[PDB]
């Protein structure tokens, strides 16, 4: 089972206005499409600098999101293909759920079994039979031979997990990941969009790899099925999602959550810009900004915090920085036994 998480590198900056206008006229009135595409072509100004935006879209437009959600949809038809997209979406009179199929045969009739595009980050889950995986590997190696076994060099991995819990860069598994990524990249024309290997992660689960890794919506997720490498189905650990099979109603897998490094860095930078822009500012405003940021992070993750042991240190360090800022505001000389009241 191979999962490819990636993102269209510069979709916003590469949406051709004429093609976008045609695609919008496909779905909306030509007057509305012309208005939207003309609104996307205006003079961008900043201080003394100004130019005209004639290639990309302007994301500050109120309807721009719609455009993105439309343009990315087209990319899905380029990735999934019309047949698989129709299988996923179901019949037009009986639309399917988010992750469901009308029949089991439709589910098992294509390598691509799960897909979610989000805004620009596509997560795809393929299930490959040994013959299909071997055929894809040979097809990829036909035009990309690797006598030196160099496919392991640039293969991205989720370093936040230990070596055993990480993805294991075995030769066959790495070859399959590269083959899957190359197959996906070949579908999308290089001009309408593109997928970059460095800014993407492919994780495969096989006999060699027991853990299925990915990252979505700031969550570093790892599924370890109970069948193979679950010594104990512990429930006390509250940062672990306990996946269940809806048919057997039995314990089958186990999901470990973790806060992504990018989310931690974003929170740290938010606290930094709270602190550094706090010279002639009231203590109440600084504490309110800190509280808002902290409650946003903690109520967004709510489980990935406990497993991310680095996030706890980051949070307490940021709290100490805020309290030190307040104390320095009160008096230049730092206190020795300042109270928490």
């Amino acid at each position: 089972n191979v999962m490819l998480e990636s993102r269209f590198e510069k979709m916003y900056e590469k949406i051709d206005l004429t093609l976008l206008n045609r695609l919008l006229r496909l779905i909306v009135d030509h007057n509305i499409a012309d208005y939207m595409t003309a609104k996307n072509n205006v003079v961008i100004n900043y201080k003394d600098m100004n130019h005209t935006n004639s290639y990309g879209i302007i994301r500050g437009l109120q309807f721009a999101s719609f455009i993105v959600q439309y343009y990315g949809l087209v990319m899905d038809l380029l990735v999934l293909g019309l047949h698989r997209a129709s299988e996923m979406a179901g019949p037009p009179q009986m639309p399917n759920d988010f992750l469901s199929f009308q029949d089991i045969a439709t589910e098992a009739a294509h390598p691509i079994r799960l897909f979610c595009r989000y805004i620009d980050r596509i997560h795809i889950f393929f299930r490959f039979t040994a013959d299909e995986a071997r055929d894809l590997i040979q097809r990829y190696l036909t035009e990309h031979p690797d006598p030196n076994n160099e496919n392991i060099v640039g293969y991205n991995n989720k370093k936040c997990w230990p070596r055993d819990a990480r993805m294991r860069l075995m030769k066959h598994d790495v070859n399959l990941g590269r083959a899957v990524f190359w197959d996906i990249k070949n579908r999308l024309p290089r001009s309408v969009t593109t997928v970059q290997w460095e800014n993407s992660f492919v994780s495969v689960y096989s006999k060699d790899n027991p853990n299925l890794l990915f990252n979505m919506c700031g969550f570093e997720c790892r599924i370890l099925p109970k069948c193979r490498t679950s010594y104990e189905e512990f429930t006390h650990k509250d940062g672990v999602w306990n996946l269940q099979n809806e048919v057997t109603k039995e314990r089958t897998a186990q999901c470990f959550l973790r806060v992504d490094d990018e989310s931690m860095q974003r929170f740290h930078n938010r606290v930094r810009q709270i602190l550094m822009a706090s010279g002639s500012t009231t203590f109440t405003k600084i504490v309110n900004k800190w509280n808002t940021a902290l409650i946003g992070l903690m109520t967004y993750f709510r489980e990935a915090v406990v497993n991310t042991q680095e996030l706890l240190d980051l949070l307490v360090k940021c709290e100490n920085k805020i309290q030190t800022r307040i104390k320095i505001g009160l008096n230049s000389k730092m206190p020795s036994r300042f109270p928490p009241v």
């Binding site: 489980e303 240190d313 307490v316 100490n320 300042f338």
Partner: peptide, 22 residues
């Protein structure tokens, strides 16, 4: 007594996150 916010990595790990919530 210092008042410094100490990290709870390994501290207060016995309790769940559902405690003290209704």
């Amino acid at each position: 007594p210092t008042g410094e916010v100490l990290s709870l990595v390994g501290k207060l790990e016995g309790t769940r996150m559902g405690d003290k919530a209704q």
